[PDB]
Design a protein around this ligand. Structure first.
Ligand SMILES: N[C@@H]1[C@@H](O)[C@H](O[C@@H]2O[C@H](CO)[C@@H](O[C@@H]3O[C@H](CO)[C@@H](O[C@@H]4O[C@H](CO)[C@@H](O[C@@H]5O[C@H](CO)[C@@H](O[C@@H]6O[C@H](CO)[C@@H](O)[C@H](O)[C@H]6N)[C@H](O)[C@H]5N)[C@H](O)[C@H]4N)[C@H](O)[C@H]3N)[C@H](O)[C@H]2N)[C@@H](CO)O[C@H]1O
Ligand SMILES: [Cl-]
Length: 563
């Protein structure tokens, strides 16, 4: 079961009452194609440290009397035997006909991370929170918990600026405390599974940003997850001038934001390599956007791409923009669901779709208004399927399900109203993903690190280091726990993810050997670097860029089992 491909979709609690979101509700979910639904979003309560609803009315009270609950052709009624209404009732009602679709509550997000910062301050608060998650999934019929903490990183000024008053004083400890949080959640959830005779899940949505990851020093938490969802989107957008892809798959040496770095990092494939340090591919999901970002008055570039703009796209090119002060005046971002961009192209023959064969995503360009908007289409879905099969990925997650497209029942020829275009939300790309994931078959089981099959030696190898972008300075402590001195000229090897490049060893000599998603680094010491019994020697060096961890550590051709 665990090697099955996964297609994980985020459900937006806020969409059902919003014009720009298409009034999307639970009966509009792509139930025939998704394997998991992540409900977005719950939060942490500031005073009790327990899981809490964001829009309680939407989640458990709304009766949908003014909305249309219909699946296929049949009217869907709320189950009157449940003690709650809202989205949660509709989810449980649909689950009866889709018993193998897993439902998870997602805690966090960009605007729901704030009270994680105070909850992680003490072990008792973490225990309270974790217990409250168990209580919540039992109460509301969820199959698991997804943690979307944005972000448990020491990187200053990362995450929502509204929360700097809580995140900035805590930067040095966030990663350690997050690791404790995830481990505690796993322990409590596993106990609840045994008690209930049910297999509850724990997942996390995680950063793909090298900037954020530079402030993450311990990725052990990943081993406690059923799967790790890489947020391989928001790579580019209106926060800066670089007119570039939202969600590229492959490294692009023409991405102007990274053109001088040792490799292009703002693409799924770099994050894949990063996380291979701690997980097999079959536990990693690719993040796919069904939304856009974009710019207007683009200067230079070719069809806008690789150009510059200080003005994110506005107006009809930004229907999902934030209403910061409730004027109806939206903050420019070029942010749209995919169906709205399709409708804009129906109305404007000079808004045209292009394909980038390097990054393997499409984009839309209006050559007269100089408007560039990212895009996603059948061709990029197909490229993403190829990548998923080629890399043995566990599947994909989608942010967010109301951005996929289908034909609009409320289409009005010639209308410019948001919900009267040819297209509205639908399942076109999600069904295409589901079909491709079925066709490629289950994941392969990635073999264990080879070091476990080698003869053991009682040597302990501890790899530590410090990151000062773009340089990782490593320090490896080697402790001899045998009863005989280890002569100089010993060697240690480790597998370094291809998100990073080994630069130099500060002592002795080294070699680098290609090894799949890693380079095997072999450090051969000098004859004078003897390790006495019960003694420790330290060697250092430099690596370019960052990596989730190292694997497959050997010492003198043996497995260093420590003491
Ligand atoms: N010495 C300095 C130089 O270091 C500097 O060079 C630059 O340095 C950068 C590193 O600091 C480097 O990388 C970029 O770093 C910036 C941060 O500084 C990163 O920018 C952030 O990118 C995030 C995405 O990865 C953005 O987050 C998104 O923000 C949007 C809003 O804009 C949110 O949207 C909301 O979403 C919710 C749902 O989630 C929805 O409800 C709302 O309606 C939406 N509004 C997103 O949720 C959120 N994820 C963030 O805003 C942004 N600041 C960037 O990613 C890194 N690439 C640069 O490459 C390098 N040039 C130079 C500068 O020239 O200065 C020298 O002095
Ligand atoms: Cl950020």
């Amino acid at each position: 079961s665990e090697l099955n491909r996964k297609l994980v979709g985020y459900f937006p609690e806020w969409a059902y009452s919003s014009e720009a979101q298409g009034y999307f509700n639970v009966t509009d979910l792509q139930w025939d194609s998704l394997t998991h639904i992540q409900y977005s979003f719950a939060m942490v309560d500031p005073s009790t440290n327990k899981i809490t609803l964001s829009n309680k009315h939407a989640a458990i009270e709304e009766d949908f009397s003014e909305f249309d609950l219909n699946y296929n052709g049949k009217k869907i009624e709320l189950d009157p035997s449940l003690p709650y209404k809202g989205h949660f009732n509709v989810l449980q009602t649909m689950k009866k006909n889709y018993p193998d679709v897993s439902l998870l509550i997602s805690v966090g997000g960009w605007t729901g991370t704030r009270c994680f910062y105070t909850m992680i301050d003490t072990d008792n608060r973490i225990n309270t929170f974790a217990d409250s998650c168990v209580d919540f999934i039992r109460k509301y019929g969820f199959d698991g918990v997804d943690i979307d903490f944005e972000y448990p990183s020491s990187t200053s000024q990362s995450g929502n600026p509204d929360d700097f008053d809580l995140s900035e004083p805590r930067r040095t400890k966030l990663n350690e405390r997050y690791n404790i949080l995830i481990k505690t959640l796993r322990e409590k959830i596993d106990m609840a599974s045994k008690e209930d005779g049910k297999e509850y899940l724990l997942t996390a949505a995680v950063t793909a940003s090298p900037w954020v990851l530079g402030g993450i020093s311990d990725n052990t938490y990943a081993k406690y997850l059923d799967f790790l969802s890489i947020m391989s989107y928001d790579y580019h957008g209106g926060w800066n001038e670089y007119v570039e892809h939202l969600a590229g798959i492959y490294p692009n040496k023409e991405d102007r934001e990274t053109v001088t770095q040792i490799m292009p990092t703002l693409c799924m494939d770099w994050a894949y390599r990063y996380y291979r340090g701690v997980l097999p591919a079959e536990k990693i999901l690719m993040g796919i956007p069904y939304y856009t970002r974009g710019w207007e008055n683009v200067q230079g570039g070719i069809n806008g791409l690789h150009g510059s703009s200080k003005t994110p796209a506005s107006g009809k090119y930004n229907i999902l923009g934030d209403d910061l002060n409730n004027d109806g005046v939206l903050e420019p971002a070029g942010a749209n669901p995919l169906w709205h961009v399709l409708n804009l192209m129906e109305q404007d023959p000079n808004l045209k779709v292009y394909w980038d064969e390097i990054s393997k995503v499409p984009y839309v360009w209006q050559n007269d208004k100089k408007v560039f908007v990212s895009f996603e289409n059948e061709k990029s879905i197909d490229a993403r399927l190829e990548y998923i099969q080629n890399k043995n990925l566990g599947g994909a997650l989608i942010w967010v399900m109301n951005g996929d497209y289908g034909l609009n029942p409320n289409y009005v020829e010639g209308s410019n109203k948001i919900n009267e275009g040819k297209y509205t939300f639908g399942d076109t790309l999600t069904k295409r993903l589901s079909q491709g994931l079925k066709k490629m078959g289950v994941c392969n089981k990635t073999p264990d690190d080879l070091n476990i099959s080698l003869e053991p030696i009682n040597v302990d190898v501890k790899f530590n280091g410090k990151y000062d972008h773009p340089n990782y300075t490593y320090s490896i402590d080697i402790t001899n726990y045998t009863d005989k001195e280890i002569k100089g000229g010993w060697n240690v090897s480790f597998d370094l993810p291809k998100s990073a490049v080994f630069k130099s060893s500060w002592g002795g000599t080294y070699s680098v050997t290609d090894n799949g998603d890693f380079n095997t680094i072999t450090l051969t010491s000098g004859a004078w670097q003897n390790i006495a019994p019960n003694s420790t020697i330290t060697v250092q060096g430099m690596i370019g860029l960052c990596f989730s961890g190292i694997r497959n550590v050997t010492f003198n051709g043996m497995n260093p089992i420590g003491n």
